[PDB]
Amino acid sequence: EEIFIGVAWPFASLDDLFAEGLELAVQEINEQGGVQGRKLSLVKADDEAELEKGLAIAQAFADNAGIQAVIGHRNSFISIPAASIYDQAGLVMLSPASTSPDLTDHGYIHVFRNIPSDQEIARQLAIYLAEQGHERMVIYYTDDSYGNGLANAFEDYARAQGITIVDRFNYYGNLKDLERLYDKWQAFGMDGIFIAKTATGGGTEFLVDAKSVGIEVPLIAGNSWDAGMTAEGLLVGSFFNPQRPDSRTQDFVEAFRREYGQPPTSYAAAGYDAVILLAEALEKSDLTHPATLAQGLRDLGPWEGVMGMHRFDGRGDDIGDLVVLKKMKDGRFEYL
Numbered sequence: 001e002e003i004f005i006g007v008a009w010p011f012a013s014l015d016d017l018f019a020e021g022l023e024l025a026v027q028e029i030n031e032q033g034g035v036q037g038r039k040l041s042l043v044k045a046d047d048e049a050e051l052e053k054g055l056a057i058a059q060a061f062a063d064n065a066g067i068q069a070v071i072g073h074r075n076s077f078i079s080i081p082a083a084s085i086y087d088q089a090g091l092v093m094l095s096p097a098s099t100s101p102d103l104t105d106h107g108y109i110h111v112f113r114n115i116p117s118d119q120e121i122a123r124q125l126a127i128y129l130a131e132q133g134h135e136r137m138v139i140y141y142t143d144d145s146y147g148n149g150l151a152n153a154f155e156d157y158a159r160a161q162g163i164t165i166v167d168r169f170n171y172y173g174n175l176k177d178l179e180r181l182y183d184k185w186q187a188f189g190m191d192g193i194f195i196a197k198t199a200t201g202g203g204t205e206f207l208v209d210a211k212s213v214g215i216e217v218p219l220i221a222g223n224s225w226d227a228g229m230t231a232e233g234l235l236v237g238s239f240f241n242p243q244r245p246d247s248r249t250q251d252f253v254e255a256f257r258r259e260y261g262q263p264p265t266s267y268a269a270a271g272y273d274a275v276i277l278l279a280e281a282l283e284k285s286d287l288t289h290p291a292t293l294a295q296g297l298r299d300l301g302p303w304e305g306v307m308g309m310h311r312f313d314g315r316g317d318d319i320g321d322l323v324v325l326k327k328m329k330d331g332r333f334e335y336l
């Protein structure tokens with residue numbers, strides 16, 4: 001017989017390699033006797049990155065008895081409200097893409113994340129920049145949920161690490177405004193810029209505008225830049241190191257290269273680990289009643305995954321060493 005886990009993701013509209021990590025993992029689990037003798041099967045639901053469809057899917061998984069746990073969703077604006085539904089149903093929701101601090105700030109007991117939050121990434125960036133001797137910086141943020149969340153965290157940890165935020169701003173109307181801003185920043189003694197704007201939503205246009213004006217200081221960004229050559233030197237805080245020395249990572253990278261003909265993405269890796277994580281917790285619990293699964297996950301760790309060690313706190317955040325800092329160099333990522 002079978003055990004099912006649901007996956008909620010914008011499958012059709014995305015080519016992120018996430019489904020390929022999933023497929024690879026399921027395969028590996030089944031070809032070793034599966035889980036408790038049972039074969040593992042995914043029930044895929046496409047949320048189209050739309051809140052209405054996201055919520056309907058969450059609902060549908062909640063009142064389907066065969067579902068042990070759900071993996072998803074990709075977007076924080078869907079995951080936060082969807083978590084409400086899984087938590088009320090006693091169903092474990094394990095998210096591999098949603099970085100918002102707010103996801104684990106509501107006392108939900110069955111809600112999990114297998115990647116570092118925007119907050120943990122921001123903290124590691126602050127530590128790194130300060131260790132490099134960065135003293136005075138400027139933040140470029142967007143006034144929305146992601147922008148504010150990431151900017152806020154970085155401001156905090158930056159002060160905690162000795163860095164002065166000399167300026168923050170969320171708008172410039174044209175290149176001469178950016179020229180005026182930069183004159184001001186030079187007077188402040190700015191030595192770096194943190195971009196808390198998504199890459200597709202204003203981040204990259206700013207990269208271009210900033211080169212064009214003559215800005216020389218290092219540039220730093222968050223997760224949404226893991227997904228042209230003027231980004232040289234851009235430091236990105238993300239996760240998954242495909243050059244991590246351990247045999248667990250190299251086996252995965254090799255197996256993936258073989259089957260798919262390209263290196264894995266961090267979403268593919270997050271996908272892979274989520275399935276293995278859930279299967280491994282599942283091999284140890286009572287499938288009779290899937291709300292023992294949550295406590296299962298908090299005693300599972302540490303669990304060696306393709307991304308590094310996984311360990312959950314009581315809020316459900318992943319708090320193992322998983323943040324990977326990446327610098328752009330000649331088109332590809334270097335790892336520090």
Ligand SMILES: [Ca+2]
Binds near residue numbers: 162163
């Ligand atoms: Ca200082």
